[PDB]
Design a protein around this ligand. Structure first.
Ligand SMILES: Nc1ncnc2c1nc(Cl)n2[C@@H]1O[C@H](CO)[C@@H](O)[C@H]1O
Length: 385
């Protein structure tokens, strides 16, 4: 029953996803709000602890006690230059506890401090409860994914987050490996298969090259930009609309925190519409000083606004190919991962770089990693019996 059941968890930097393989198919499990992905946010309030959508929804009201980006801290030392650099951009406090970072917050009127693995365990607990509500029984066996460049310390702290959450961690697998499993790329029989995984998420960009020789996976190269993602595209739309508001009304809105956040959430929504329509409308009632902001934007203007950012995704693709010592024609498969790969211009740039090649994109790119993890968790739990 429960002991023969296993889930697949994509524990992402900005969003997490949970899947289950049963009756010959993967089911990506929707949360209580009906969303197939859940924000990796934990809010500490005067009365409760919020996880996911509810935590993301009150981030503007409570920025000092809303934790996110815990994956950027997990398995790292406080003195690490990555930690020191990132700390300057977060609204929550990061403290040093014997060269280990802890996030310090106000919770139910008291000062509390948590290890990154304790924060990630709260996200994992929510993913586990989303699966339990769907299945009708508690599921404890799980496959948890990590980026291919995570070292032993980061992998061990992710497994510890799984233990704190009440999960029996069957295996910690690489995100690009879970994505290649989702597309059944390890079941093509004999001969080495070269796979490129193009992963463009909310806050990070990763390119991975794998060789699959008789079911065995090998990471040949990893490249990317840890500070490039969907949120940089939203911010480009934000700057455009701030300049448009200034031209129409001769008023600068940039200093009004509420106006910028309402514009930001509307921009993110409009960006998603632009992936399936050639125009999107913004409808913001009383944006600033009682002025409604009812406008539109073409996909052509959006592509111009982000042009340099889209083009920059091809430098790590080239870097990964040189590190892997492979030419373009030596890559058998191209796999898309991350919500931002739905952007038509991104797909066109990648397809043209690979000389008009077909892309593996039929599985929802923000769900492909959880999908593969769910497949692996089913195989692993069957072998355990
Ligand atoms: N339809 C879409 N068109 C463009 N961007 C999208 C889309 N869906 C998601 Cl999710 N994202 C973005 O992906 C990230 C999460 O993986 C977020 O930045 C989200 O906006």
């Amino acid at each position: 029953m429960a002991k023969a059941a296993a889930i697949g968890i994509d524990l992402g930097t900005t969003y997490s996803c949970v899947g289950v393989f049963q009756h010959g198919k993967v089911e990506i499990i929707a949360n209580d709000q009906g969303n197939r992905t859940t924000p990796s946010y934990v809010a500490f309030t005067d009365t409760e602890r919020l996880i996911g959508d509810a935590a993301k929804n009150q981030v503007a009201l409570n920025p000092q006690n809303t934790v996110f980006d815990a994956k950027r801290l997990i398995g790292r030392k406080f003195g690490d230059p990555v930690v020191q650099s990132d700390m300057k951009h977060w609204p929550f406090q990061v403290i040093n506890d014997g060269d280990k970072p802890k996030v310090q917050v106000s919770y139910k009127g008291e000062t509390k401090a948590f290890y990154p693995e304790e924060i990630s365990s709260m996200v994992l607990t929510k993913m586990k409860e989303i699966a339990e509500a769907y299945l009708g029984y508690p599921v404890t066996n799980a496959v948890i994914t990590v980026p291919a460049y995570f070292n032993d310390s980061q992998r061990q702290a992710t497994k510890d987050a799984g233990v704190i959450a009440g999960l029996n961690v069957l295996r910690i697998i690489n995100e690009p490996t879970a994505a290649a499993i989702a597309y059944g790329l390890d079941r093509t029989g004999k001969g080495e298969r070269n796979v490129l995984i193009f992963d463009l998420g909310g806050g990070t960009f990763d390119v991975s090259i794998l060789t699959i020789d008789d079911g065995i996976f090998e990471v040949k190269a990893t490249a990317g930009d840890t500070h490039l993602g969907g949120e940089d595209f939203d911010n480009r739309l934000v700057n455009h609309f701030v300049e448009e508001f200034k031209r129409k009304h001769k008023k600068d809105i940039s200093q009004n925190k509420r106006a910028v956040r309402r514009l930001r959430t509307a921009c993110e929504r409009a960006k998603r519409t632009l992936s399936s329509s050639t125009q999107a409308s913004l409808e913001i009632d009383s944006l600033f000083e009682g002025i409604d902001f009812y406008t539109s934007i073409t996909r052509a203007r959006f592509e111009e606004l982000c042009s340099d950012l889209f083009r920059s995704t091809l430098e790590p693709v080239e870097k990964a190919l040189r590190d892997a010592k492979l030419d373009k024609a030596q890559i058998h498969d191209l796999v898309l991962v991350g919500g931002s790969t739905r952007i038509p211009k991104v797909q066109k740039l990648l397809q043209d770089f690979f000389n008009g090649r077909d892309l593996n994109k039929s599985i929802n790119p923000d769900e492909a990693v959880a999908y593969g993890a769910a497949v692996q968790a089913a195989i692993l739990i069957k072998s355990t019996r």
